[PDB]
Amino acid sequence: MNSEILNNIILNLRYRDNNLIDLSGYGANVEVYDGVELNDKNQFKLTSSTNSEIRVTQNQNIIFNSMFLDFSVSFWIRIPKYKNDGIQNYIHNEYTIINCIKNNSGWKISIRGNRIIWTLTDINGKTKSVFFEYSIREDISDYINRWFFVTITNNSDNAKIYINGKLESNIDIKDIGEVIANGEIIFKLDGDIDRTQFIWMKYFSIFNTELSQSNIKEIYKIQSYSEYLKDFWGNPLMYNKEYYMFNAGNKNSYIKLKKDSSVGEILTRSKYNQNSNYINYRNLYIGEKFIIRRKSNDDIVRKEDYIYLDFFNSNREWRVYAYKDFKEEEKKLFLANIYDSNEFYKTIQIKEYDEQPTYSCQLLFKKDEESTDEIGLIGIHRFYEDYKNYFCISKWYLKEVKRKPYNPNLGCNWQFIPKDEGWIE
Ligand SMILES: CC(=O)N[C@H]1[C@H](O[C@@H]2[C@H](O[C@]3(C(=O)O)C[C@H](O)[C@@H](NC(C)=O)[C@H]([C@H](O)[C@H](O)CO)O3)[C@@H](O)[C@H](O[C@H]3[C@H](O)[C@@H](O)[C@H](O)O[C@@H]3CO)O[C@@H]2CO)O[C@H](CO)[C@H](O)[C@@H]1O[C@@H]1O[C@H](CO)[C@H](O)[C@H](O[C@]2(C(=O)O)C[C@H](O)[C@@H](NC(C)=O)[C@H]([C@H](O)[C@H](O)CO)O2)[C@H]1O
C-alpha cells in the first residue's frame, strides 16, 4: 500500500471484537449505540431507530483543524432501491447519513433518493455541495442496492467525488472559506425518512491529504480483494442459499428450464411495468432458483472450491451436468434429478479469472477424480434449431479467460442474486 495513503490516514474505523474502533494510530473515541448492526465483514447498518447511531470524537489533542485544508473521505455504501409505491418520497426527501459540524461549520454526507451529496460549510455560513447521481432508469444498475466505493477529495480549489476509482463529480470551492472539520462525527439517518429506511456502510476512513486518482484506484483494489466469491449485491457468496443467476455478458438474459426438456433456455428479463415513467429496471427475481452445494467452519464459497450447481424444479432439487461425449466447442448443459452417471460430469470448480474488482465468478467443469484436466466453462451460446440461446459448456472460454486484460463481457461471467430486503420488485 502506497506510503502517500498509509502515512496520511487520520481516522480508520474498523470492526474489532463486536465493536467499531479507530485503528489510525491517533486513538479517536468511538461509541456504537445499540441500534447499529455490525458484522465481522466490517459492514454496519444505520436504521430509522433513535439508537442507530455512531459517535466518533476525533482526538483534538493530536488532530488540528489545519490538517483538513487538504483531506479525503473513503467508504463503501449499499443504498436500497426505492419502494415502487414510494417514488415521490424517495426523489424529494434528503436525509443526512454522516455529519461533522462544529458551530454550524464542517462537512456532511447526505442522500436524496439516487444521489449521494457532499456539503462543506465554512465559518461564514457559505456552503457548497457536490453530488453523485446514479440512474434509476437502467435495465441493470451497477449501484442500486449494490456495494460501491466512494472517495471524496478536497483541496483549496476543488472537491471531487470518485465512484469505484473513477471521477464522477468536481466543483470549484475557491470561494469557500475556513471549514471546521475536526469536530464530532455522527453516523445517523437524519431527515424525513420512512420507518423502513436503512443504509449499509463499510471501511469509513479519513485522510489528511488530497488522494490522487492512482491512490484511490489502489484503495479500491485492496478493499475489493477477498479469498471468497461475492454475490450480485457484493456480499459473500454462500453455500445452501437460493440464488437467481445473472450473466455479466448478457445482462438482460436469464435461465429457464425448457418445459418438458433437460436444457436451460436463455430468455429476456421482464421490465418494470407500473405507472411511474421516472423509473425503469429489468426484474432480477426471475428464472430458475439455483443453490450451491459443497462437493465435500462457515458456509462461505471460496475461490477454487469444488461445488455442485443445483436448482429447484417442481418441489425437487435438480443438478447441472455436462455430457462427457463433448466433441464440439460448445454443448447444451444437461439439467436433471440428482444421480450418478459415467456419462456426465457433475463436479464444478468455482473460479475468479478477473484481476480487477468484480462480483462475477466463473464455473469450470472438472472430472470426478482430482485431475488437472479442464472440460469447459459454463456460459451461453446460440445453437441451430433459426438459432436459439442455451445454457452451455464451452471449450472456447478456456483460452478466452487466459487473455489479458480479462474481458468482463465474456458469457462465462456469472453473478448470484439472492432475495434482498433492499430490492423489492
Ligand atoms: C462470432 C462467432 O460466431 N464466434 C464463434 C467462433 O466462430 C468462428 C469465427 O469467429 C471468430 C471470432 O471469434 O470472431 C472469427 C475470428 O476471425 C477468429 N479469430 C482468429 C482466427 O484469430 C476467431 C477464432 O478462430 C475463434 O474464436 C477461436 O479462438 O473466430 C466465425 O467468424 C465463424 O463464422 C462462420 C459461421 O460459423 C458459419 O456458419 C458461416 O457460414 O461462416 C462464418 C464465417 O466463416 O465460425 C468460426 C468457427 O467455425 O467459434 C468459437 C468456437 O471456437 C465460438 O463459438 C465463437 O462464438 C462465441 O462462443 C461462445 C461460447 O463458446 C459464446 O457464445 C460467445 O458469445 C458471448 C459469450 O462470451 O458468451 C455472448 C455474450 O453475450 C457476449 N457479450 C456481450 C455481447 O456483451 C460475448 C462477447 O461478444 C464476446 O465474448 C467478445 O467480447 O460473446 C460467442 O461469441
Residue numbers in the entry: 856 to 1151, 1157 to 1245, 1252 to 1291
Pull text from the paper:
Botulinum neurotoxins (BoNTs) are bacterial toxins produced predominantly by Clostridium botulinum. The heavy chain contains two domains: the receptor-binding domain (HC) which is responsible for targeting neuronal cells at the presynaptic neuromuscular junction, and the translocation domain (HN) which transfers the LC across the endosomal membrane within the cytosol. BoNT/B, /G, and /DC instead bind to either Synaptotagmin I or II (SytI or SytII). BoNT/B2 from Clostridium botulinum strain 111 was first identified in a case of infant botulism and initial characterization found its toxicity to be approximately 10 times lower than that of BoNT/B1.
Separate crystallization experiments containing only GD1a and HC/B2 were successful in producing crystals in the space group C121, containing the ganglioside-bound complex which diffracted to a resolution of 1.8 Å. The electron density for the entire GD1a carbohydrate is well defined. Our GD1a-bound structure of the HC domain from BoNT/B2 reveals a highly similar binding conformation of both GD1a and the HC domain when compared to BoNT/B1. Neu5Ac5 forms hydrogen bonds to N1273, N1275, G1104, N1105, G1277, and Y1263. Gal4 hydrogen bonds with His1241, I1240, S1260, and E1190, and also forms stacking interactions with W1262. GalNAc3 forms a single hydrogen bond to E1190, and Neu5Ac6 forms a single hydrogen bond to W1262. When comparing with the B1-GD1a structure, the central Gal4 superposes extremely well, but minute variations in the position of other monosaccharides are a potential result of differences in surrounding loops. One such difference is residue 1275 which is a Lys in B1 and Asn in B2. In our ganglioside-bound crystal structure, we observed a potential water-mediated interaction between N1275 and Neu5Ac5 which may result in improved binding affinity. Adjacent to N1275 is P1274 which replaces a Leu in B1 and likely provides more rigidity to the loop in an orientation that could favor interactions with the Neu5Ac5 moiety.
